[model samples]
Target chain A: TGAAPADAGSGLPALYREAVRTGRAAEMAELLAAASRFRPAFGTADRQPVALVPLADGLPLLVGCAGTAVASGPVEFTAFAGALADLPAAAPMAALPQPGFLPGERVPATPEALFEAQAEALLRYAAGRPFVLLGHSAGANMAHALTRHLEANGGGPAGLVLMDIYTPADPGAMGVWRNDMFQWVWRRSPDDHRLTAMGAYHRLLLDWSPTPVRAPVLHLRAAEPMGDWPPGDTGWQSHWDGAHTTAGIPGNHFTMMTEHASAAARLVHGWLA
Target chain B: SGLPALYREAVRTGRAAEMAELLAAASRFRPAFGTADRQPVALVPLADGATGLPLLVGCAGTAVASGPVEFTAFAGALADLPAAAPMAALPQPGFLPGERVPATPEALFEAQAEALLRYAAGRPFVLLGHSAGANMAHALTRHLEANGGGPAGLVLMDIYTPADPGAMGVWRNDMFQWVWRRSPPDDHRLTAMGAYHRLLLDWSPTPVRAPVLHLRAAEPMGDWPPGDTGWQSHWDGAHTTAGIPGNHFTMMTEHASAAARLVHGWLA
Candidate 1:
């Protein structure tokens, strides 16, 4: 379905970026699928990777870091998604899939399969190494699950990174705009599915509580928080059963892991190391 | 090592309704625990074996993904037998919602032991376990005997005891090729192979007290592992071998009818 790489309004990969910027759902579909090369996601008979390579370079235990609608967004660290997959400024990024964002086919709506989807890829290819796992928004939840899943099975990472995990308790959650954010999508299409999926992920997170993990963790707040960046952010510390830490990076939830990746990655580098 | 997402939530919250609902959904493939939604046993019902003997419980091999679907094939073969018994099959754990893989074989044995008791519900029965499912059968029989209950007999299939056939025989289909030849394309080869490798290397399971019939795959796992010969030395009872044409993975499908006749012979 993605074979027809819709023109990105510019040359080379610029079109893909512009499509994501303009929110042209069709172009974003092609660009997202185009830029990503899909491998079968781990532990599943299904879960395929949608790869837009040159793959992220690696050598050691550089575990996975992913985002809300975008699971493979880690390369956006030193630069944007349009840049080279290798970043000398970055640690080897242990790659994980962005399962929810893909268009065209239906996928698991809850973060559980999404978590194992990441776990399968991580464990299968990562070769049981220790490293940081950073999940932002929807993926923030998965990042924690992978940590718990791994820690339970054996050992876990040097650290856990959670970016902009939302809790509806904050005042911002009661606001009018928050309701429409997910309501805005109108068609019966992949982007529409992704939008509805966001609500599913959001609900699943609120409903799902993770198993206790001994792995140390770091929660980085988006200045604006995904939805008010709930305070009591460090509440997860109670569940850590070990070490826990928190930070306020420069960007709001939207930009913290993207336009502001370096700010987050810089801290992540030392934190994981 | 999967704990289905839905079950974990139900168990943590103590929501019996949700637990029942999820179990019902799971019963679509696994029905032994019933729509009541109980433990992780997948005693999925088949057309009841007409054998009118006690009961028959078949355990599929190690892979969690190879569910009741795999057992239905051979179980169906034996169902039409006038002498066939009432039957059920136990899928390995780590399937079903809320299920967690046990940390060791005995813990695994402990879990399956309870599931077998519930599945049999006091009816004296026979057991048919394939591959490492055979390994589980060995443990289950030992469990029953220890409790002063025992199966009529055991039919253990091409149960390869790893590395006693240590090093490659250099004759079998490479692991990947043999797996795909027998399993569906989506079978969790990585996870299943991982389970078997760990199972063989670490397990020192107790022997079954019942007279055991070891069903050997006439072919070889080739480079894979040694035969079930180690069982005789491990078990405390009379042990015998019945060779089924074809290799380990092929025994169930290629020699299924022959395998069924041999299994029924012992049960009868």
Candidate 2:
């Protein structure tokens, strides 16, 4: 969805980015709900140059990654991406998959494996389009890896939108974070495997840490945390050698997109997509 | 693996002490790290104000289900209600990506309450909530009363009030411990739960001027809480308690249609 901002000064897109960085997400909620659209890009059969990976037939693909399986899934962004389609230029978007998350995928054995496999899947989906990547939580970690991966491989992305998952000042708080929320999800025995995908994802995230990337990393940090969650787990400050930017989304990690879909879509539509 | 089941069954079977002790033994309930951020209230506009009246819904969970999804079943039941009244549900923030949600109970509540005020603008509205949300509904009543106009009426469904201080603490303690031990810890959840437990046990809310319709769950939350009279004594206006079917969670799950009917009747 590409709607040119008048005067070559896109008031909404610029403000959308500013609002996110400044933690004025509440304002964004209204701005997005009222604004008409995002920058127009992507065609049914167009491709960006420097094709590391041949893209999605033609359209500039908007690839999404949901937070960790324990937190949410690509399904969370299904409607979100669809809403983007109805935005400026009514762009098309595709959601990435986690192992066992989609019917055919199997959960990767380790964090490294999961990251590598998802990166491969993302490239394949892009086909020939100039794909931009956006991922939340664990998905975001992989997005960083993929950004570097694409850059090294030649078909680097336009950008990467990373949400949540920052490294905290006090890693101790991370303990409280993992113990409290995922207790139930992880309590499932391997045999029971009930919600095991979530269990496995969290397992990987526990050991997972951010690495440097070559592409621009658009950090979609939450404006407020509902409770005592670590604010800097994504580690954009300490890690990520890429061009890093932080924009605040209005809601907490759990309700980031769920509660603030319009605002998120506005931000995503303008910046990444 | 069985810890969740253990806590679930423990609470279901009225094992309050065991649960509390376990929680107490787990990590100590420290104040959640980081200062709470200023967040805008989350106001989900559901229905138009065709009838001139408004319905304000406070959410215990996400506003997603409480707005359209929750109201889809109550069309005919609420037919008699004014068409001009609008409907909105305010969701509690949970570390939303952009806006701030430090998981501080007061910050969360105040933001939502302010949201209601902004949406109301200058009109009277009926308020509704269930469980923890109902507690917020009461506080909002006081807030609105002090501001200018209070809700037309209040519908509180199965709001939990821990009468027995000891039993309540036990319940909270168990929750703390259970969370402390669970897989892939979640600090936000811990802080929210801990704060909620403290609020449940400690907040001595003053009475409000608005009349209240208390929807009591037929099944109690184990053997805790003083009584429905807890809020009744604080209410400066009329108060009535109606027995609703099922337990706390089940009440909303199985008998929601009936609850909607009651809401319709109250509004009518």
Candidate 3:
């Protein structure tokens, strides 16, 4: 009730601030109202292209990158925040929204450009506090790049969590384009901006060779592979040249972030612990 | 010939005639993998030398369903040469209507090389690939060389390998136009284009024994100074780098005749 604390520089709305502050979903629902034109989840602030939702408050800020979008809508940071409800109070959290389908927004055409821009913004917020980066699918690419940049700049995350990322040279991954079923579904004429951008991310990482980082990496793979992936293949072959520990999470590529989000969150929490 | 078993059986037994029709319409829209479309590769004839010693085969850039369409004018210009070999241009997979897209870039190249080999049937050939096609042609040349058949020579038109940082930067806006203005929302080429984009990203170029020619565009595509001056060819073999008359796309467009004459002279 006390003026909801000052949120001028935070790049987030009052409702979202209170929601995270009080750990309540009801407040988040109000902020997520369909009628509201200003969605902090997809909206940009003075310093960030995607508004950063500050969850909890402590050192080593936990950053979430939900790069997956389904049915033309992005997987909002709020959904990611909700999935981490069970995360401990010590590790403060923040969610980085993927670029939305909205026009007039500055969508960097290349992943390298996007990574540099995001790295700058995250550095500003991180402000000397140690942080951890986590992402799923294309978001995993983002997290990996961010870690690379942050470590290069002398402030790196404590760890990284990559969820269901495809190896750049994986032949099995061609199944995404080859499967008749997925072709039918992708043909539904989803949002071109998101689809094209998603394709760009895939193209960017196609030749990306992940460099070794000082921080430990938690690679969470999907249990059930997508398309006609080879039998017994988990679809999480490591492209990262650095050493990483791998674990299986329930669900396929998309579901690993949706239905089994809690199961994923549990793994991340244990790794962080 | 009747439609393939998949299409016919789907129509008669699986009650998927509509799907078959949709695909048929797609085949009409762009070159396809199905033999019924007689595509995935096109064979062009030269009037003077109907059958020459070395066949000239073309590979298109990352454009969707580019194939023969992309090479049409270029092929025509080459034909005007005093001496020219018959030409064939390979269309990337997933460009045709109802065509099955490959899961990997290697698979795509393998299928293309297979069909191309069948068409050549032991004929010595010179390989020419433009833009992203250079990557494919390089790989295909290597694949053929591995299997005891290789191009007599290799020509990389405005070549740019995946390793180049800014290789794809200039096409950022052009790609947007291809998605939004150039093609409609429902066009399958849009998906096909993206599929190739992904495939190309996964591909790497290796040096081939075939003598290499790199034709750089005379005009820069983007503004100078921290801008896209286009790529420098790093093909590490017996190579000759020359400048073509137009910008990257136009070298194959308005300046096709000039490029054709230049290529013909090299062949001679």
Q: Count the backbone clashes (under 3 Å) in each candidate.
A: 22, 84, 3
TM-score of 2: 0.38
Q: How would you encode candidate 1's per-residue C-alpha lDDT over B139-167 as one tens digit per residue?
A: 67776687777788887775545445332
- Tell me how each candidate scores on DockQ against the true complex: 0.01, 0.02, 0.01
Q: Evaluate chain B of model 1: give its TM-score.
A: 0.68
Consecutive 10-residue window with the lowest summed lDDT within model 2 chain A: A33-42
TM-score rank order: 3, 1, 2
TM-score of 3: 0.45
lDDT of 2 by residue, A1-273 (tens): 112213121122233333334444333333322211111112223222111222122236777765554335556675466556667564457666555433323455444455455556666666666777877756776566557656766767777778765543223433344333333222321211223344445444545456666566677766655446445553322223354666687876555766776677777666653
lDDT of 3 by residue, B136-208 (tens): 7887888788877789999888776554436445443443333233222333554455456555655676778
DockQ (model 1, Cα): 0.01
Task: Please give, for every candidate in the order listed, the TM-score of chain B alone compared with the true chain B.
Answer: 0.68, 0.64, 0.75
lDDT score, residue B25, model 3? 27
lDDT of 2: 0.50
Best by TM-score: 3
- A1-273 in candidate 1: lDDT tens per residue? 012224211121232233333434342333223222121122345554433222345324555555444223444343522232434554555556555445543345444565556666666665656566666655666677778777776767777767665443231332322422222222101223343333344444445464456667777775653333245463322122333767777765556656776677666655655
lDDT at position B97, candidate 3:
49
**Which regions of candidate 1 fall more than 4 Å away from where they truly are?**
A1-273, B1-39, B96-99, B103-107, B163-173, B181-200, B221-238
Mind giving the per-residue lDDT tens digits that candidate 3 earns over A1-273?
Answer: 222434331111222333334444222322222111111222123333655657544336788865533232333344455767656754667866545435435344555556556776677878877778988766776677778877887777889888766544453463342233223224433433343344334445555666677889888877765545544463434234454678887776666666787787666766674
TM-scores of the models, in the given order?
Answer: 0.42, 0.38, 0.45
